[PDB]
Amino acid sequence: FTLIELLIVIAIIAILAAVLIPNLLAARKRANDTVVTAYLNDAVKFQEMYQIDNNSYTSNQAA
C-alpha cells in the first residue's frame, strides 16, 4: 500500500461523498405537504363531528 493508491482512495471518497447523498430539502418538502394534507383531512372529519353536535361548522380551532 503506497501514496498513489491512497490518493486514488481519497479521490474516489470525494466522488462518492458528493453523489451518494440525496437532496434532503426536496424529500422533506414532500413529507411536509403530507403532514398538511393529513391535518386538513382530520380537520374535515372534526368539522363533520361538530356539525353532528351543533348543526353548524366551527370557525374556531379550539372547538
Ligand X SMILES: *[C@H]1O[C@H](CO)[C@H](O)[C@H](O)[C@H]1NC(C)=O
Ligand Y SMILES: *[C@H]1O[C@H](CO)[C@H](O)[C@H](O[C@H]2O[C@H](CO)[C@H](O)[C@H](O)[C@H]2NC(C)=O)[C@H]1NC(C)=O
Contact assessment for residue 57 and residue 50, using Cβ atoms and an 8 Å cutoff? yes
Site string for ligand X, 43-62 (x = CB under 6 A): -----------------x-x
The size of the interface with ligand X (CB under 6 A), counted in residues, is 3
Q: How far apart are the C-alpha atoms of 62 and 28, rounded to whole Å? A: 28
Minimum CB–partner distance for residue 63 and ligand X (Å) = 3
Is residue 23 near ligand Y by the rule CB under 6 A?
A: no
Minimum CB–partner distance for residue 27 and a copy of itself (Å) = 27
Q: Which is nearer to ligand Y, 5 or 53 (CB)?
A: 53
